[PDB]
């Protein structure tokens, strides 16, 4: 009955919110136990329940972001958090298309005078 992220992948949002609430109720009881003289087993359960709480929130956040990215896939403007991070300097670079652009004067020069392959006899 341990919580594993794989088991949680396909579930609905409200189903995970319910599962989250049960763990949060459980942790609060354990925190009451921590000060009323609960056995070592209950104390050790705190860390197990805390990471179970993290796992559920992780799967909720991940699932929500996955669908937001699908939502904004075809959109021109996306939320700043859905745009590539990279580094600040790399985000300000000329993009792929802009770097490939050449003036018509340079395109004609390359067509008429392409660098050739040759050899010189020894």
């Amino acid at each position: 009955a341990k919580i594993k992220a794989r088991d949680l992948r396909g579930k609905k949002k409200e189903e995970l919110l319910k599962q989250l609430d049960d763990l949060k109720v459980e942790l609060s009881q354990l925190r009451v136990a921590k000060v009323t003289g609960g056995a070592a087993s209950k104390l050790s359960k705190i860390r197990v329940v805390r990471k179970s709480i993290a796992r559920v929130l992780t799967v909720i956040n991940q699932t929500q972001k996955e669908n937001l990215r699908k939502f904004y896939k075809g959109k021109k403007y996306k939320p700043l958090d859905l745009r590539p991070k990279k580094t600040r300097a790399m985000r300000r670079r000329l993009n792929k298309h802009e770097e490939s652009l050449k003036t018509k004067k340079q395109q004609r020069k390359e067509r008429l005078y392409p660098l050739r392959k040759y050899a010189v006899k020894a």
Partner: peptide, 25 residues
Amino acid sequence: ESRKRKRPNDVDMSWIPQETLNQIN
């Protein structure tokens, strides 16, 4: 049975936050 077990594409609009849904409608 226990001894047996212990030895072995599109947007889901329900996961979109409400606020985004309100903005589009």
